[PDB]
Amino acid sequence: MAQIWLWIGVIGMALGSIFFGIGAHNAKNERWKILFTINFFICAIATGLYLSMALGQGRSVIAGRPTVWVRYITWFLSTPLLILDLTFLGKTSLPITASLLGANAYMIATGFVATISADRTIGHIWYVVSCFAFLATVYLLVNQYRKQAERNYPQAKKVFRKLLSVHLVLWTLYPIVWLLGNTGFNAVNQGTETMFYTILDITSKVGFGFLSLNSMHTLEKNTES
Amino acid sequence: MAQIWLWIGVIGMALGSIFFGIGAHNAKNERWKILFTINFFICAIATGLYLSMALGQGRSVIAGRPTVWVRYITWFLSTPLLILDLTFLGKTSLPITASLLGANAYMIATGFVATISADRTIGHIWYVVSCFAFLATVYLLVNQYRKQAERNYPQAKKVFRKLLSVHLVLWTLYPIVWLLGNTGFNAVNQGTETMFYTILDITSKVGFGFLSLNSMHTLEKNTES
Amino acid sequence: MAQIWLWIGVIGMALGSIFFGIGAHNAKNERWKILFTINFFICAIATGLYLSMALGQGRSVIAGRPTVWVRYITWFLSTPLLILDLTFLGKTSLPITASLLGANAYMIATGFVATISADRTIGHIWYVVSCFAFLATVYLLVNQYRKQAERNYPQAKKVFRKLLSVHLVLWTLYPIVWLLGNTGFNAVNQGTETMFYTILDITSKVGFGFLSLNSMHTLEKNTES
Numbered sequence: 001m002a003q004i005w006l007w008i009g010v011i012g013m014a015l016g017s018i019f020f021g022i023g024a025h026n027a028k029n030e031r032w033k034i035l036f037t038i039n040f041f042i043c044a045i046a047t048g049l050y051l052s053m054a055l056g057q058g059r060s061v062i063a064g065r066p067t068v069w070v071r072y073i074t075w076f077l078s079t080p081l082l083i084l085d086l087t088f089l090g091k092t093s094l095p096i097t098a099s100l101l102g103a104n105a106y107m108i109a110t111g112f113v114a115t116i117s118a119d120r121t122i123g124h125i126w127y128v129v130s131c132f133a134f135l136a137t138v139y140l141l142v143n144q145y146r147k148q149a150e151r152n153y154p155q156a157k158k159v160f161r162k163l164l165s166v167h168l169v170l171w172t173l174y175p176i177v178w179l180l181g182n183t184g185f186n187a188v189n190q191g192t193e194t195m196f197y198t199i200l201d202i203t204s205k206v207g208f209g210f211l212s213l214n215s216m217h218t219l220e221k222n223t224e225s
Numbered sequence: 226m227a228q229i230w231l232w233i234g235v236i237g238m239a240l241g242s243i244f245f246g247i248g249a250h251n252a253k254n255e256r257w258k259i260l261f262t263i264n265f266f267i268c269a270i271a272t273g274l275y276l277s278m279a280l281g282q283g284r285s286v287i288a289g290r291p292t293v294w295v296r297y298i299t300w301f302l303s304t305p306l307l308i309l310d311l312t313f314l315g316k317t318s319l320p321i322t323a324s325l326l327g328a329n330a331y332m333i334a335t336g337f338v339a340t341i342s343a344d345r346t347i348g349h350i351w352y353v354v355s356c357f358a359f360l361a362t363v364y365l366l367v368n369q370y371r372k373q374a375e376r377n378y379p380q381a382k383k384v385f386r387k388l389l390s391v392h393l394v395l396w397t398l399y400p401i402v403w404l405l406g407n408t409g410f411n412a413v414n415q416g417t418e419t420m421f422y423t424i425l426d427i428t429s430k431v432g433f434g435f436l437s438l439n440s441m442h443t444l445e446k447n448t449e450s
Numbered sequence: 451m452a453q454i455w456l457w458i459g460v461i462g463m464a465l466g467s468i469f470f471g472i473g474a475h476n477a478k479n480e481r482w483k484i485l486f487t488i489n490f491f492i493c494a495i496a497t498g499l500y501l502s503m504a505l506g507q508g509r510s511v512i513a514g515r516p517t518v519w520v521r522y523i524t525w526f527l528s529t530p531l532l533i534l535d536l537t538f539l540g541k542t543s544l545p546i547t548a549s550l551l552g553a554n555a556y557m558i559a560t561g562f563v564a565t566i567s568a569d570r571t572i573g574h575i576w577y578v579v580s581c582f583a584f585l586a587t588v589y590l591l592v593n594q595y596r597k598q599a600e601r602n603y604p605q606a607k608k609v610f611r612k613l614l615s616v617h618l619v620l621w622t623l624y625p626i627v628w629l630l631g632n633t634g635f636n637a638v639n640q641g642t643e644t645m646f647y648t649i650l651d652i653t654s655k656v657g658f659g660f661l662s663l664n665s666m667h668t669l670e671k672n673t674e675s
């Protein structure tokens with residue numbers, strides 16, 4: 001079950017990479033070129049993640065607990081680009097963009113520590129820290145990010161409402177999966193945990209990528225001269 | 226002794242993070258927002274460092290020598306922000322900012338190698354290299370950085386004199402502690418070495434952070450219309 | 451044989467660092483200062499690489515195969531600067547610069563995985579992936595990069611022809627050496643592989659550095675008022 005879902009991730013991320021790469025190659029306009037390029041690299045990074053996992057790499061047995069550490073390495077590179085999708089579309093200011101990238105980096109890094117710690121009490125402390133770094137981004141996203149975006153696109157508040165809702169709901173599922181997997185309560189087996197992360201990853205990367213493109217189209221139409 | 230000082234670092238860095246974060250949240254002005262945000266992340270990074278150390282992580286016994294490697298990982302992230310404090314305040318040019326960030330990165334990286342090398346003769350070679358990377362920053366700071374800053378703020382040369390004096394004196398103490406600890410002569414025990422680094426870290430992060438804010442206030446007053 | 455070539459690299463990279471550093475110190479003009487600074491750090495990074503290797507560091511015996519992993523760590527830092535040499539000189543746009551830096555980062559990262567994988571079939575898969583990341587840069591370099599550069603310097607198309615030819619020919623030799631060494635067919639001994647990488651590194655760093663400076667001189671003369 002685990003193995004098939006890892007190859008599904010390889011396929012899904014590769015297809016995402018191809019179609020965003022084609023879009024980047026054909027883009028009319030530097031802003032479109034940038035947006036396609038961000039999403040291409042999100043999916044290209046993840047294709048490499050899923051290939052490494054599918055080939056059996058990136059995994060260690062830590063004190064008897066099988067632990068996939070490689071996803072934190074690539075997440076640390078792809079999740080800032082997903083943030084960049086948001087801050088590019090919302091024309092976010094530099095301090096708020098940096099704060100979002102910093103808080104997100106903090107989240108992934110402490111999530112990594114929460115995962116690889118042999119002492120699972122210590123790991124669960126870092127999980128809480130990581131959750132508070134995530135909540136920091138939530139605060140930034142629904143306050144400063146949203147207000148700037150709505151100020152920049154007064155006629156497109158719904159566009160950013162949908163971007164934020166999809167981002168927040170989907171990303172909140174990750175710490176839930178983490179608590180369900182062998183990092184926490186071990187309420188689901190490894191094959192189910194792998195399926196969950198794979199579906200989340202494809203949705204949060206390929207799915208959000210296409211939403212960001214659709215969002216861009218609406219923003220440009222709303223701001224046609 | 227070591228354990229208490231690690232928790233003192235957690236507390237001190239957390240308090241620094243809180244007060245810089247409050248300042249960032251209330252800031253009047255993008256330049257103030259940026260400066261508070263830089264210092265928030267300096268202290269937030271260090272809070273995580275000190276929590277990891279306080280919980281017993283980030284340490285290895287290398288050929289019988291207890292070695293705290295995690296501080297080099299976080300220093301590599303926080304020390305460039307301390308440089309950014311300086312180059313933001315001094316409106317430093319791009320090549321000099323990059324040179325400062327590069328030389329500082331070189332210093333921390335070779336300091337890491339100087340620390341983890343089992344062969345302590347090799348480690349001491351890297352210590353010398355790291356010292357010369359530090360001296361490179363000294364040269365850049367008291368020459369190009371200072372002249373640009375004084376050119377940008379002709380009425381505030383004292384402000385940059387104090388920033389540089391505090392930076393240079395405090396940062397020079399780090400290679401001294403390193404020579405005193407079990408990385409060099411082992412003239413002080415681990416508990417004293419830990420206290421020294423903790424006091425240095427709190428002063429160079431929380432202390433320098435507040436100095437940078439005071440400096441900003443003086444710079445803006447000197448350049449009030 | 452291996453040991454002498456590692457020290458030759460230390461010497462050659464150190465000399466490159468010194469002369470680019472002198473050029474940076476004397477530069478007339480921010481653009482010249484930037485270009486000298488990029489090449490200084492390329493060579494300074496590599497000096498540290500070659501010192502670590504010369505001192506016997508950065509090498510592991512992986513399942514019986516001596517494997518120099520440290521070169522991928524420093525290549526990951528120096529090769530983007532060589533790209534920056536190109537994109538600085540060609541005034542490349544942001545999406546194409548990012549795409550070049552991203553594809554190059556992908557190449558080095560999968561090259562690292564191709565090298566350290568104990569399962570050499572898996573390693574050879576990553577070698578192919580890394581080759582396709584390199585071919586991605588080739589496509590970007592001879593298409594978008596070149597057209598932008600020729601548009602920016604219509605009277606200096608030969609300058610970018612020489613830059614690209616030297617970059618492409620020299621960098622293509624690296625995957626050939628990799629196939630010849632114990633990472634692939636093991637057709638040359640370690641001492642010869644080390645000599646090959648050392649000569650390639652000195653040429654692609656010190657040599658390309660001086661070519662980039664000569665290129666800059668021609669570009670500025672062609673665009674003298």
Ligand SMILES: CCCCCCCC/C=C/CCCCCCCC(=O)O
Pocket residue numbers: 076077080094095098099101102103105259262263266306309312313
């Ligand atoms: C791989 C992605 C890593 C993301 C790291 C994010 C770091 C966040 C830290 C923010 C502090 C800096 C805030 C902005 C500084 C601007 C500097 C300047 O204007 O001179």
Ligand SMILES: CCCCCCCC/C=C/CCCCCCCC(=O)O
Pocket residue numbers: 301302305319320323324326327328330484487488491531534537538
């Ligand atoms: C985590 C912090 C890491 C800091 C790394 C610093 C790297 C220093 C290297 C400098 C070389 C580049 C100099 C400026 C390049 C400008 C490029 C351009 O203008 O196109």
Ligand SMILES: CCCCCCCC/C=C/CCCCCCCC(=O)O
Pocket residue numbers: 034037038041081084087088526527530544545548549551552553555
């Ligand atoms: C150490 C060097 C590492 C190089 C990493 C290169 C990353 C390449 C990824 C590209 C995606 C981003 C494309 C440009 C984003 C611009 C963002 C913006 O304008 O807000």
Ligand SMILES: [Cl-]
Pocket residue numbers: 045046049074075078
């Ligand atoms: Cl990923």
Ligand SMILES: [Cl-]
Pocket residue numbers: 270271274299300303
């Ligand atoms: Cl730190």
Ligand SMILES: [Cl-]
Pocket residue numbers: 495496499524525528
């Ligand atoms: Cl290198």
